[PDB]
Design a protein around this ligand. Structure first.
Ligand SMILES: CN(Cc1cnc2nc(N)nc(N)c2n1)c1ccc(C(=O)N[C@H](CCC(=O)O)C(=O)O)cc1
Lengths: 114, 114, 114
């Protein structure tokens, strides 16, 4: 899986270990081993949510399978949870887009997963 | 809805009001209240379009509904106009990817919209 | 077609000409004229892949058609090769998302491609 966070929060507000924590928790939540989890944190961004410049985030989780109704609520609870506690971002100022990828449409190691 | 602009235009040429202006014009164009609109502007990017490094933009509009053949043609006018006037980008150097998101695939406030 | 690379490799390791080369290679590989090809390189990113912050990359290729089982393998070979050769990134620390865009969902110059 691939998790990306874009936020207006400063670089200096990202705690040491946040990428490690996201990796480990997305492994648990997703059922996929840690070695397949990629994480990307883009702080200091020029953004607004509802016309306000308070702390916010635009995020995406891409995964081959492991994407659906209940799973996505469950991921949003986890991720909103972490964004609140670690980055101090209100859960109502987060969007997370979920993408179920076909294996044939993910390249890796000179090939695809199809 | 969510709107993202990636551009090689420098940070200093992004007007201070650009995120609000986007926010407001997107609310009108989509029919959704401004509160639902998130906007992200990423300047100083290392980009080329058609092999030239003249000013350009790669953008995305994600929304739950309000995406279609007719609406997308319309949004391109609006957004090429804003980018042309505010960032001095030629409209032929602008791509915009449109995504019609399922409610179950959009996380927000510890849950999803489903 | 549109190709984006997000990497933790530093800005100073991106060779001069990398954007041109990508453009050239994507044109030949897709059979689309170079004028329709946009490339975007984002270095210095805060990323982890499998828990490790060794060199890695997360990438997207968006294109109207020219996306499929075999074409995507061939693109992966080409692009991981280029990421291995120019950015010193190991192929198994690269993910590439392929998206077959409907023409009506790509805005360009005040309209769509539908
Ligand atoms: C068969 N599966 C998933 C899967 C399901 N159940 C499991 N159960 C167990 N006990 N262990 C596993 N390793 C496991 N893996 C897989 C198919 C492809 C990929 C994969 O290696 N990578 C992509 C990368 C996605 C992206 O970047 O877009 C992914 O799974 O999301 C992994 C697992």
């Amino acid at each position: 899986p691939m998790f990306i966070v874009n936020t207006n929060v400063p670089r200096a507000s990202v705690p040491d270990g946040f990428l490690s924590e996201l990796t480990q928790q997305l492994a648990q939540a997703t059922g996929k081993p840690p070695q397949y989890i990629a994480v990307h944190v883009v702080p200091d961004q020029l953004m607004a949510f509802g016309g306000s410049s308070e702390p916010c985030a635009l995020c995406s989780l891409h995964s081959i399978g492991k994407i659906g109704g209940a799973q996505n609520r469950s991921y949003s609870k986890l991720l909103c949870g972490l964004l609140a506690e670690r980055l101090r971002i209100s859960p109502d100022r987060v969007y997370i887009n979920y993408y179920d990828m076909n294996a044939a449409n993910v390249g890796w190691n000179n090939s695809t997963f199809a």
